[model samples]
Target chain A: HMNDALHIGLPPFLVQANNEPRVLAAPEARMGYVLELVRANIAADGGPFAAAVFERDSGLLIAAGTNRVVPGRCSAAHAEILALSLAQAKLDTHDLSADGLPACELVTSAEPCVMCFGAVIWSGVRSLVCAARSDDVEAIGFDDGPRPENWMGGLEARGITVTTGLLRDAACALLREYNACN
Target chain B: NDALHIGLPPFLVQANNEPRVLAAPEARMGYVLELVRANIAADGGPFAAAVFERDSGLLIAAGTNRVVPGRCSAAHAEILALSLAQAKLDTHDLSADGLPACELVTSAEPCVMCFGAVIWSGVRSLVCAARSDDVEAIGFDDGPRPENWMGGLEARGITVTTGLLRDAACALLREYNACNGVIYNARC
Candidate 1:
């Protein structure tokens, strides 16, 4: 499987490039160039990026700490890769600068358990990820609340140990880029 | 894939001499032939030569040594191929044949298609070798081969070459594709 080509964590920067002056408060901005290139590539090949499939199966979120929401558009495979990259980047390195900003991972789901594992060891902060619950357009029981904001705790209880930091300004961070879940 | 044989019409033939060949009202036919032959000889172009009698629909391909091959489509193609030879002669002097001039020899009626084709070739002038007394049409007027001439009005004021027409006439899409990659790029 193609691993996450790009991941977001903490300062949300990659080894090859520097992060935004402020932490990537906007995940979409973090890798907008890469996403645009991929989208164009897929479109030229008569692929699904030009259709509804990308939105239906993909998303973006903050993983290490929840201060920022990453904007992402991708296929299911690509979403998973984004999530994994976020988790792994968190694990590989903490903030490159001293007094590192509170690290966060950008993912596509609430349960980024698999990818977050690596970050747990590296950043020593709880790895975060976001996900979609279902495709229902209408409101229903807790199961159909659209954003499924509560799922983060679901992973917390799973005993995948880390220092959980529930970011106080979740709404502001989430809106930086569109939320595929909502 | 088919081979030529003894039963085929004499492969090379020439036009019957017309004692009183009438000049086309607008375009010149003989001049086109002159240029076409010059191009063939000068370029050592790959082609066969042909002449078609519109009244009888009889075709004659030019023989290798100045003789006329008998009635044949292949001969027609060979003759038509000479245009390419001509084209190489002087690319800039294309209109010397009086093509785009709308002057057809036999028919008093204007050849709408041939005029358009000449215009499309972006050539200022064009000429026909002979007029079609049996039928009247214009654009990409005279082709080097009979097989490569005529028929296409799909887009108004648009014309294909006689070579294009002849190919369409014979359903030689596969063979045409082998020689030209234009259709392939469009599809790909």
Candidate 2:
């Protein structure tokens, strides 16, 4: 069943463009860039989502991903999961925070759904930064699922810092760009 | 970036010519349990799950935990079955219009991570053989979940069936415990 293998990766454009190592020194630059990925993915006919992993202090790019859920035919192929899994594969370890690795952070175009939220905790990232809120995502008809109401506390409880509302209006605009709902 | 391959390993895939359709829940669970037994024997986790078209009982995919071996904590059995089933269906949603309703039958209740996954995978129903408590009894964490996890899925319009083969599923967990299988807790 070689054809039946379940997998996903960044689109070709991302792969080609990110081939060169780039460092973003500001949180705004990071979120702004992920929003651009979301825009590119929409133009590439994907969902209105993108996410990436970065070295928390140095801001070095690790992995970036766009929503390949429908295209890849795997519901688990959300942007965040793709990004996190790719990073793990690149580093050859499941735990990103394993000893000898620099602290890493997950930056996403939208706040996580329940599955991606759990993925963040399990991926061993040091922090989470979000652009669009779940409500913003739901407004566009994407089911954010039944995530815990205090999902921030849940992540914080596990030592993963949480940040929201960076470039949020722009992120919501990208959701509208996807056109699945409105 | 290249595709990360995810599916049953060759040993598991070569174990049998899988059944096509299973209308009986016990029969579905029986096959999942058989997969679980094979998984543990082959150095995988003590869990297994399969997705079937609810009405026609067409076997879509079978999966077992590949977390440690796969080197990703998100590679749980439920996620594999759900994603592989979606791959076969060519859609993120199993309940998409014009598609047959699907059910996920698992050897144990989903962990907290998998509970969220089942909701998003768009399956119409889920059936469990072992309880989360049974998973925890073997030193595995189901992770955090809402108080009424079933109601949450129900609110999302997915039905739930628990304990289809409680004693048998419990026996598998106990067997894994006896083997001292690695827990792979999240805090790692």
Candidate 3:
């Protein structure tokens, strides 16, 4: 499975030259960048998937990942996965346990799909912020997967804090634009 | 209403030729059913999907949901197939003019995400065996009605065909739910 033949390079938007990740100001600020990246991705027909990982305490942007299925990468190479992998590579550690990310947060334009939901927990990110709801992402035609009504509660049970509705209107606007264009 | 979503991107297969249409649906039905069976045995969600070259009936790719077992939900059959095909083609946009000769065949009606992928993918046609409600009946939200939203698939010019081998498809869902005691909905 780790065969070099199975590897696909990152899309330009995701490929960072110098591994120097950026730190951000706040949740909304992080979301702004996430939106910008996703918007460009959508414009490029890269699929409506994008995400950013940040230092939990300082809010510095560590890396970003967007959907790149067009080049035939594994479907698991989603924005969240890409961002987390990038962060893990930079930290040079495989153990992204709670202690590993301590205070690191992931801010995404849409709610984490169940797959990403599990990744967030396993990756050891301390917090999660969703700019748009699962319903919102669905409106644009991407399945957010089967999630319970109290999804946040489920995350909290696993020791991950959750925050929603950060720039929700703007996030949803992108979905709306995606719908219209598609 | 800019021409933002109008044409296919550079990476999808775009041809200036006429699309191939099947004279009968029997073979296509069998192919999709095979995928459904594989999905159940693989412990994937009770669903599977495949993509084909429209005229030649060439199967581009096939997949089942990895969500029930811990993969990303975006790994749903239809999405996976679409992504794989696009990746194989090495381009993202696979809309109407891009691959009018392509078609998407799924075991169940696509949920919202898969359905959206259909539109975004730009495949000229969609064929499925079971209904979304069939999946939803056992627990899972397929999302808003395709026809009710954004003028529907038909309005968008993607021909849709459904209910092929419907009973077999529904049986797969029921069996998966019964044997595994699968949760009908997400716990979160």
Candidate 4:
């Protein structure tokens, strides 16, 4: 039985397999909004559009349009280094150069993946957003999976956010509005 | 709206608990699950018992009759399975019939995968019975149960120490130690 709030829903990706983090943001409305807005503006950009907006706390995208991607659970046991590596993927994506209009749309897999929201707040752009549960989930599965690589033991954990909904609207508005001037 | 069991994080609610925090993650989660299960165990409650997770999200073992202390919610003599799933955890009671049996095993430490599992499952209201320090003593448990503090603060007036940088429990740990250290004169 479902217990959490209605606003909260699993990313469509988790419901299905064979999806990646980058492609997962399609189903996420907030992420999709950013991508859509950016995509429309930069249809002729050389490569993929680089959104200045960043997802605080490593936000994950449940869906983007019809495309879906599930955010894999990272553990200190099985995914110790993998977790850290995934954390830095945002920075590794592009040069994060300061462009005039907007360069790209940054989509996070989940919120609070890391402690500080530095990447989003300090990305030279004022816009920042996240697609996450206002509540928390219980993920203590530390056992080895069928995958060749799995870890032993597990740590059951949870988180509590002050806000009840995703920060996508607020953060995005901040960026679009913040950059109104020179 | 549905009758569901509220899944908790591995931590506890203590006004001034150990590990300097209320409770550890794994213990807190276990405690919350047990508490909800306990409520369900009551006459005409939600669930028969609580659910257990040995590997964070990879596998969630349920509370078994032999493992739990109190009377089993409802003993189904047939083959019982561990009541664990990767779905959203809540605080209501739903479909209750001749289901499976569960365990009541307790742990000392918290796991890491559970964090993401909890997040993915979208369970915000985490409840637990064990204290954070006790879980710490158990060793190898490294998850932080923040909902304990939230539940405590909501139900009572107790204050918990946590960082405001979003969801960094470690940040709060440092903040708590540093703040307390200065007030208590623990250091020179």
Report every candidate's CA lDDT: 0.25, 0.82, 0.63, 0.26
Q: Best candidate per DockQ, number?
A: 2
* Ranking of predictions according to TM-score: 2, 3, 4, 1
TM-score of 2: 0.91
Model 2 residue pairs with clashes: none
C-alpha RMSD (angstroms) for model 3: 10.3
CAPRI-wise, candidate 3 is: incorrect
DockQ of each: 0.01, 0.58, 0.08, 0.02
Q: Which whole-number lDDT from 0 to 100 does residue B54 have in model 1? A: 21
Off by more than 4 A, model 3: A1-8, A11-25, A32-50, A53-63, A67-182, B1-23, B95-100, B145-151, B182-188
lDDT of 3 by residue, A52-163 (tens): 8788778777667776555433445567756665555555443345253546677888887655665665566778888888878777677654444566886787677999
lDDT of 2 at B89: 73
lDDT, candidate 4, B1-188, per-residue tens: 11112222222112002222113344433443443334323321111122333223222223222211221111110001111322222211111232222122222111232322222222222232333463354332334333443443334322222211122233223333344322544441
Tens digits of per-residue lDDT for model 2, B59-124: 888788886677676888898888877776778888888988899999988876788889888898
User: Candidate 1 on B98-182: residue-level lDDT in tens?
Assistant: 4222211211111322222222222221223233431223222221111212332223232323321232222222322344333
Q: How well does candidate 1 score on lDDT at residue B108? A: 14
lDDT tens digits by residue: candidate 2, A78-106: 88888887778777778898899899999
Of 3 and 4, the candidate ranking higher by TM-score: 3
Share of reference contacts kept by candidate 1: 0.00
